Tab-separated table of N, CA and C in Angstrom:
chain	number	residue	atom	x	y	z
Y	1	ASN	N	94.207	77.666	24.666
Y	1	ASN	CA	95.043	79.230	24.455
Y	1	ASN	C	94.999	80.316	25.689
Y	2	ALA	N	94.253	79.899	26.600
Y	2	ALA	CA	93.737	80.549	28.107
Y	2	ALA	C	95.053	80.637	28.678
Y	3	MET	N	95.719	82.052	28.756
Y	3	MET	CA	96.857	81.985	29.524
Y	3	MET	C	96.761	82.637	30.741
Y	4	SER	N	95.826	83.220	31.292
Y	4	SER	CA	95.238	83.973	32.396
Y	4	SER	C	94.748	83.394	33.367
Y	5	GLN	N	94.883	84.254	34.684
Y	5	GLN	CA	94.366	83.219	36.014
Y	5	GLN	C	92.617	83.443	35.601
Y	6	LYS	N	92.294	84.203	34.529
Y	6	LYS	CA	90.615	84.042	33.720
Y	6	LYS	C	90.260	82.282	33.900
Y	7	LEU	N	91.273	81.375	33.432
Y	7	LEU	CA	91.278	79.994	33.520
Y	7	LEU	C	90.666	79.428	34.782
Y	8	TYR	N	91.038	79.959	35.838
Y	8	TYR	CA	90.862	79.022	37.047
Y	8	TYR	C	89.368	79.454	37.145
Y	9	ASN	N	89.221	80.206	36.874
Y	9	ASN	CA	87.282	80.211	37.096
Y	9	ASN	C	86.583	79.524	36.409
Y	10	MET	N	86.794	78.731	34.848
Y	10	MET	CA	86.147	78.573	33.806
Y	10	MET	C	85.906	77.069	34.573
Y	11	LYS	N	84.541	76.802	33.943
Y	11	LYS	CA	84.311	75.241	34.639
Y	11	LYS	C	85.242	73.732	34.056
Y	12	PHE	N	85.500	73.148	35.476
Y	12	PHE	CA	86.292	71.788	35.197
Y	12	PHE	C	85.611	71.327	33.850
Y	13	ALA	N	84.559	70.810	33.755
Y	13	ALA	CA	84.194	69.782	32.806
Y	13	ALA	C	83.753	70.243	31.556
Y	14	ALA	N	83.868	71.513	30.722
Y	14	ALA	CA	84.301	71.838	29.780
Y	14	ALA	C	85.387	71.843	29.329
Y	15	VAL	N	86.380	72.623	30.248
Y	15	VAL	CA	88.111	72.181	29.678
Y	15	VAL	C	88.415	71.197	29.686
Y	16	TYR	N	88.158	70.440	30.790
Y	16	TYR	CA	88.436	68.931	30.717
Y	16	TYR	C	87.948	68.177	29.285
Y	17	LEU	N	86.714	68.786	28.584
Y	17	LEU	CA	86.681	67.662	27.915
Y	17	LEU	C	86.928	68.602	26.566
Y	18	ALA	N	87.349	69.790	26.499
Y	18	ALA	CA	88.222	70.250	25.619
Y	18	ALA	C	89.399	69.612	25.042
Y	19	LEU	N	90.103	69.262	26.230
Y	19	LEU	CA	91.331	68.404	26.236
Y	19	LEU	C	91.343	67.251	25.388
Y	20	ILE	N	89.715	66.402	25.938
Y	20	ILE	CA	89.765	64.964	25.242
Y	20	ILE	C	89.500	65.191	23.933
Y	21	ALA	N	88.675	66.353	23.600
Y	21	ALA	CA	88.034	66.084	22.120
Y	21	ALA	C	89.684	66.970	21.155
Y	22	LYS	N	90.507	67.635	22.048
Y	22	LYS	CA	92.116	67.555	21.364
Y	22	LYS	C	92.702	66.190	20.587
Y	23	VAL	N	92.673	65.242	21.993
Y	23	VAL	CA	93.052	64.423	21.752
Y	23	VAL	C	92.385	63.052	20.777
Y	24	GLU	N	91.321	63.135	20.712
Y	24	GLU	CA	90.208	62.813	19.854
Y	24	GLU	C	90.348	62.822	18.402
Y	25	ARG	N	90.378	63.992	18.121
Y	25	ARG	CA	90.736	64.579	16.878
Y	25	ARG	C	91.950	64.550	16.636
Y	26	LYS	N	92.870	63.723	16.781
Y	26	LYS	CA	94.343	63.344	16.564
Y	26	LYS	C	94.582	61.728	16.362
Y	27	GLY	N	93.231	61.174	16.589
Y	27	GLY	CA	93.573	59.833	16.802
Y	27	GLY	C	93.576	58.885	18.195
Y	28	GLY	N	93.839	60.042	19.124
Y	28	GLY	CA	94.040	59.361	20.388
Y	28	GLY	C	92.773	58.701	21.457
Y	29	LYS	N	92.757	58.368	22.428
Y	29	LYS	CA	91.689	58.209	23.002
Y	29	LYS	C	91.416	58.293	24.596
Y	30	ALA	N	89.841	58.782	25.100
Y	30	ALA	CA	89.823	60.116	26.592
Y	30	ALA	C	90.125	59.101	27.578
Y	31	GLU	N	90.110	57.833	27.272
Y	31	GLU	CA	90.693	56.815	28.577
Y	31	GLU	C	92.434	57.676	28.801
Y	32	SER	N	93.530	57.739	27.692
Y	32	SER	CA	94.455	58.050	27.993
Y	32	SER	C	94.711	59.325	28.623
Y	33	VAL	N	93.752	60.303	28.366
Y	33	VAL	CA	93.644	61.941	28.890
Y	33	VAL	C	93.427	61.544	30.560
Y	34	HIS	N	92.687	60.400	30.999
Y	34	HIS	CA	91.889	60.315	32.288
Y	34	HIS	C	93.372	60.071	33.164
Y	35	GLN	N	94.169	58.766	32.392
Y	35	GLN	CA	95.377	58.172	32.804
Y	35	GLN	C	96.458	59.134	33.057
Y	36	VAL	N	96.658	59.769	32.403
Y	36	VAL	CA	97.998	60.864	32.368
Y	36	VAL	C	97.743	62.089	33.761
Y	37	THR	N	96.173	62.082	33.884
Y	37	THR	CA	95.772	63.546	34.694
Y	37	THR	C	95.474	62.701	35.820
Y	38	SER	N	95.441	61.616	35.890
Y	38	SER	CA	95.164	60.513	37.327
Y	38	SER	C	96.384	60.512	37.792
Y	39	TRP	N	97.204	60.235	37.277
Y	39	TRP	CA	99.035	59.793	37.338
Y	39	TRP	C	99.975	61.385	37.914
Y	40	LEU	N	99.239	62.615	37.361
Y	40	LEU	CA	99.808	63.778	37.542
Y	40	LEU	C	99.421	64.711	39.133
Y	41	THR	N	97.992	64.507	39.036
Y	41	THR	CA	97.358	64.781	40.054
Y	41	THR	C	97.554	63.930	41.345
Y	42	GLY	N	96.836	62.839	41.390
Y	42	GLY	CA	96.643	61.384	42.300
Y	42	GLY	C	94.971	61.107	42.768
Y	43	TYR	N	94.443	62.077	41.599
Y	43	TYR	CA	92.750	61.752	41.706
Y	43	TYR	C	92.416	60.328	40.973
Y	44	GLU	N	91.736	59.684	41.869
Y	44	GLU	CA	91.728	58.211	40.888
Y	44	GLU	C	90.684	58.972	39.450
Y	45	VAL	N	91.093	57.934	38.601
Y	45	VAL	CA	90.193	58.165	37.534
Y	45	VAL	C	88.831	58.240	37.775
Y	46	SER	N	88.343	57.516	38.673
Y	46	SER	CA	86.675	57.654	38.737
Y	46	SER	C	86.258	59.035	39.462
Y	47	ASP	N	87.505	59.587	39.885
Y	47	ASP	CA	87.558	61.251	40.733
Y	47	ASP	C	87.295	62.041	39.668
Y	48	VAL	N	88.021	61.867	38.472
Y	48	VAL	CA	88.014	62.954	37.661
Y	48	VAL	C	87.003	62.991	37.118
Y	49	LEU	N	86.544	61.475	36.681
Y	49	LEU	CA	84.918	61.558	35.881
Y	49	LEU	C	83.851	61.793	36.438
Y	50	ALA	N	83.680	61.880	38.248
Y	50	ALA	CA	83.125	62.281	39.096
Y	50	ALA	C	82.716	63.590	38.871
Y	51	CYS	N	83.965	64.559	38.710
Y	51	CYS	CA	84.112	66.122	38.579
Y	51	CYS	C	83.293	66.576	37.336
Y	52	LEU	N	83.072	65.711	36.501
Y	52	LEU	CA	82.295	66.303	34.887
Y	52	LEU	C	81.067	66.627	34.932
Y	53	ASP	N	80.874	65.575	36.199
Y	53	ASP	CA	78.965	66.168	37.137
Y	53	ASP	C	79.012	67.075	38.288
Y	54	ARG	N	79.926	67.669	38.247
Y	54	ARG	CA	79.970	68.792	39.442
Y	54	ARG	C	80.402	70.078	38.759
Y	55	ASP	N	79.988	71.260	39.602
Y	55	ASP	CA	80.279	72.364	38.778
Y	55	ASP	C	81.610	73.111	39.456
Y	56	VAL	N	82.331	72.355	39.921
Y	56	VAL	CA	83.681	72.690	40.188
Y	56	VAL	C	84.268	73.491	39.322
Y	57	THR	N	85.159	74.401	39.461
Y	57	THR	CA	86.099	75.184	38.531
Y	57	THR	C	87.194	74.393	38.177
Y	58	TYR	N	87.930	74.811	36.694
Y	58	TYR	CA	89.116	73.979	36.531
Y	58	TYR	C	90.443	74.737	37.331
Y	59	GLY	N	90.319	75.713	38.010
Y	59	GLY	CA	91.312	76.289	39.264
Y	59	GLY	C	90.938	75.099	40.286
Y	60	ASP	N	89.644	75.005	40.849
Y	60	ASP	CA	89.192	74.832	41.712
Y	60	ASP	C	89.635	72.978	41.974
Y	61	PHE	N	89.878	72.690	40.719
Y	61	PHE	CA	90.235	70.940	40.553
Y	61	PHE	C	91.883	70.816	40.700
Y	62	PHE	N	92.447	71.869	40.214
Y	62	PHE	CA	93.918	71.589	40.663
Y	62	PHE	C	94.236	72.114	41.983
Y	63	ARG	N	93.689	73.269	42.806
Y	63	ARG	CA	94.034	73.193	43.850
Y	63	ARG	C	93.842	71.965	45.121
Y	64	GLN	N	92.547	71.598	44.589
Y	64	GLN	CA	92.013	70.213	45.196
Y	64	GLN	C	92.812	68.908	45.014
Y	65	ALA	N	94.086	68.855	44.090
Y	65	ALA	CA	94.491	67.630	43.935
Y	65	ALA	C	94.987	67.084	45.062
Y	66	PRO	N	94.951	65.656	45.434
Y	66	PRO	CA	94.868	64.689	46.738
Y	66	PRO	C	97.033	64.828	46.772
Y	67	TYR	N	97.508	64.522	45.938
Y	67	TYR	CA	99.013	63.933	45.679
Y	67	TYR	C	99.680	64.070	44.171
Y	68	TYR	N	100.399	65.326	44.267
Y	68	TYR	CA	100.886	65.831	42.762
Y	68	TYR	C	101.999	64.811	43.078
Y	69	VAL	N	102.420	64.148	41.861
Y	69	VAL	CA	103.448	62.969	41.755
Y	69	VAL	C	104.886	63.887	41.650
Y	70	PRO	N	106.155	63.697	42.270
Y	70	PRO	CA	107.125	63.791	42.443
Y	70	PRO	C	107.618	63.911	40.959
Y	71	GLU	N	107.727	63.183	39.998
Y	71	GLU	CA	108.294	63.452	38.732
Y	71	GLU	C	107.663	64.298	38.053
Y	72	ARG	N	106.568	65.152	38.152
Y	72	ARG	CA	106.000	65.831	37.275
Y	72	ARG	C	106.834	66.982	37.421
Y	73	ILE	N	107.779	67.230	37.941
Y	73	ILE	CA	109.288	68.359	37.936
Y	73	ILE	C	109.786	68.000	36.870
Y	74	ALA	N	109.677	67.233	35.997
Y	74	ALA	CA	110.765	66.673	34.786
Y	74	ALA	C	109.584	66.995	33.914
Y	75	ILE	N	108.575	67.330	34.147
Y	75	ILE	CA	107.965	68.075	32.867
Y	75	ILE	C	108.236	69.118	32.545
Y	76	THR	N	109.371	69.529	31.441
Y	76	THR	CA	110.280	70.454	31.331
Y	76	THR	C	109.508	70.876	29.970
Y	77	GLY	N	109.985	72.265	29.268
Y	77	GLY	CA	109.658	72.829	27.873
Y	77	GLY	C	108.647	73.508	27.855
Y	78	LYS	N	108.125	73.579	26.923
Y	78	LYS	CA	107.105	74.736	25.886
Y	78	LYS	C	105.987	74.125	26.192
Y	79	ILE	N	104.703	74.759	25.833
Y	79	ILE	CA	103.748	74.651	25.635
Y	79	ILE	C	102.415	75.792	26.342
Y	80	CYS	N	101.618	76.074	24.916
Y	80	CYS	CA	100.753	77.323	24.835
Y	80	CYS	C	101.509	78.312	25.373
Y	81	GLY	N	102.944	78.471	24.134
Y	81	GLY	CA	104.124	79.922	24.222
Y	81	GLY	C	104.895	79.914	25.265
Y	82	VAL	N	104.915	79.151	26.493
Y	82	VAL	CA	105.688	79.504	27.228
Y	82	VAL	C	106.608	78.572	28.212
Y	83	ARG	N	107.479	78.661	28.947
Y	83	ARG	CA	108.301	77.451	29.622
Y	83	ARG	C	107.864	77.463	31.135
Y	84	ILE	N	107.056	75.626	31.167
Y	84	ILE	CA	106.749	75.358	32.405
Y	84	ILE	C	107.390	75.541	33.125
Y	85	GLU	N	108.863	75.114	32.923
Y	85	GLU	CA	109.279	75.180	34.515
Y	85	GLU	C	109.740	76.638	34.800
Y	86	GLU	N	109.762	77.615	34.056
Y	86	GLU	CA	109.543	79.239	34.556
Y	86	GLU	C	108.496	79.662	34.979
Y	87	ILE	N	107.267	79.059	34.827
Y	87	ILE	CA	105.823	79.688	35.155
Y	87	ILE	C	106.306	80.379	36.728
Y	88	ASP	N	105.917	80.992	37.069
Y	88	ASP	CA	105.922	81.988	38.518
Y	88	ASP	C	104.631	81.541	39.595
Y	89	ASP	N	103.412	81.331	38.262
Y	89	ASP	CA	102.448	80.930	39.634
Y	89	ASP	C	101.999	79.286	39.271
Y	90	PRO	N	102.334	78.801	40.654
Y	90	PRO	CA	102.142	77.507	40.562
Y	90	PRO	C	101.395	76.484	40.460
Y	91	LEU	N	99.865	77.405	40.395
Y	91	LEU	CA	98.869	76.406	39.873
Y	91	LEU	C	98.808	76.475	38.355
Y	92	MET	N	99.055	77.417	37.625
Y	92	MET	CA	99.282	77.737	36.102
Y	92	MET	C	100.196	76.315	35.886
Y	93	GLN	N	101.131	76.165	36.730
Y	93	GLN	CA	102.762	75.984	36.082
Y	93	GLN	C	101.987	74.111	36.649
Y	94	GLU	N	100.767	73.858	37.346
Y	94	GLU	CA	100.400	72.021	36.992
Y	94	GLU	C	99.913	72.317	36.228
Y	95	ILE	N	98.756	73.300	36.014
Y	95	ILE	CA	97.610	73.139	34.656
Y	95	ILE	C	98.510	73.046	33.257
Y	96	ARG	N	99.382	73.926	32.980
Y	96	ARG	CA	100.392	73.412	31.683
Y	96	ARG	C	101.442	72.042	32.277
Y	97	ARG	N	101.535	72.094	33.138
Y	97	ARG	CA	102.117	70.270	32.919
Y	97	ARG	C	101.352	69.766	32.391
Y	98	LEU	N	100.168	69.362	32.961
Y	98	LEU	CA	98.801	68.698	32.025
Y	98	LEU	C	98.698	69.088	30.635
Y	99	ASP	N	98.764	69.992	30.321
Y	99	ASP	CA	98.827	70.370	29.050
Y	99	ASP	C	100.136	70.072	28.165
Y	100	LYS	N	100.750	69.853	28.865
Y	100	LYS	CA	102.053	69.214	28.287
Y	100	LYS	C	102.146	67.569	28.202
Y	101	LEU	N	101.547	66.789	28.885
Y	101	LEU	CA	101.129	65.460	29.110
Y	101	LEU	C	100.246	65.610	27.932
Y	102	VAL	N	99.227	66.042	27.815
Y	102	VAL	CA	98.124	65.953	26.964
Y	102	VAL	C	98.506	66.001	25.263
Y	103	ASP	N	99.540	67.162	25.440
Y	103	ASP	CA	100.160	67.266	23.855
Y	103	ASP	C	101.032	65.932	23.550
Y	104	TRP	N	101.501	65.355	24.698
Y	104	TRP	CA	102.086	64.232	24.041
Y	104	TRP	C	101.028	63.133	23.272
Y	105	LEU	N	99.937	62.977	24.055
Y	105	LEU	CA	98.834	62.137	23.759
Y	105	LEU	C	98.436	62.494	22.521
Y	106	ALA	N	98.238	63.940	22.216
Y	106	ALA	CA	97.729	64.348	20.851
Y	106	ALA	C	98.591	64.240	19.621
Y	107	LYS	N	99.802	63.701	19.993
Y	107	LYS	CA	101.162	63.774	18.846
Y	107	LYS	C	101.240	62.278	19.225
Y	108	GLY	N	100.561	61.048	19.602
Y	108	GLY	CA	100.623	59.917	19.286
Y	108	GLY	C	101.013	58.686	20.165
Y	109	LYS	N	101.157	59.669	21.409
Y	109	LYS	CA	102.087	58.744	22.446
Y	109	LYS	C	100.801	57.836	23.035
Y	110	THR	N	101.415	56.685	23.790
Y	110	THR	CA	99.944	56.356	24.357
Y	110	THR	C	100.316	56.859	25.947
Y	111	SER	N	99.408	56.665	26.623
Y	111	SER	CA	99.663	57.283	28.343
Y	111	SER	C	100.411	56.534	28.888
Y	112	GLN	N	101.033	54.920	28.874
Y	112	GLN	CA	102.025	54.045	29.311
Y	112	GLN	C	103.092	54.529	28.796
Y	113	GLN	N	103.488	55.089	27.378
Y	113	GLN	CA	104.736	56.030	26.966
Y	113	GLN	C	104.781	57.097	27.135
Y	114	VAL	N	103.683	58.190	27.635
Y	114	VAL	CA	104.205	59.431	28.772
Y	114	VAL	C	104.131	59.286	29.926
Y	115	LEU	N	103.673	58.174	30.734
Y	115	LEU	CA	104.312	57.673	31.983
Y	115	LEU	C	105.754	57.525	32.285
Y	116	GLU	N	106.154	56.696	30.914
Y	116	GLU	CA	107.328	55.901	30.761
Y	116	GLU	C	108.687	56.938	30.601
Y	117	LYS	N	107.992	58.213	30.281
Y	117	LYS	CA	109.009	59.100	29.585
Y	117	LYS	C	109.271	59.646	30.760
Y	118	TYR	N	108.570	60.204	31.913
Y	118	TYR	CA	108.589	60.702	33.287
Y	118	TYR	C	109.237	60.227	34.216
Y	119	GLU	N	108.628	58.893	34.332
Y	119	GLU	CA	109.124	58.074	35.689
Y	119	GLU	C	110.198	57.891	35.599
Y	120	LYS	N	111.592	58.599	36.560
Y	120	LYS	CA	112.571	58.172	36.671
Y	120	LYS	C	113.139	57.180	38.048
Y	121	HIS	N	113.596	56.260	37.555
Y	121	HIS	CA	114.569	55.325	38.251
Y	121	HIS	C	115.966	54.872	38.643
Y	122	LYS	N	116.546	55.175	39.548
Y	122	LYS	CA	117.869	54.905	40.115
Y	122	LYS	C	118.638	54.475	39.451
């Protein structure tokens, strides 16, 4: 429930491990989190894991994402109290899109089901 830009300067590793803990507490798997994070940001799963041993901030992880996936614009709706598509701050908006993907995992979707939700075909 970190809502402000104070989030950007919190350490990546602790913040990301808390996402995983949420999913594991609800019977999901750490690997599913890595998979949806990789999909969203363009980071390889191994890249995400390497960041656990760095002192990079959560904000700087998102600022340096190699390739945001086009289908992420379809990640709409509410999370952490606010409408994702109406978030003005572009960095917070990507962060909240990850929170939405992780919410699906905490709610029992596999990463395959989450990707299938947002990948759009002609």
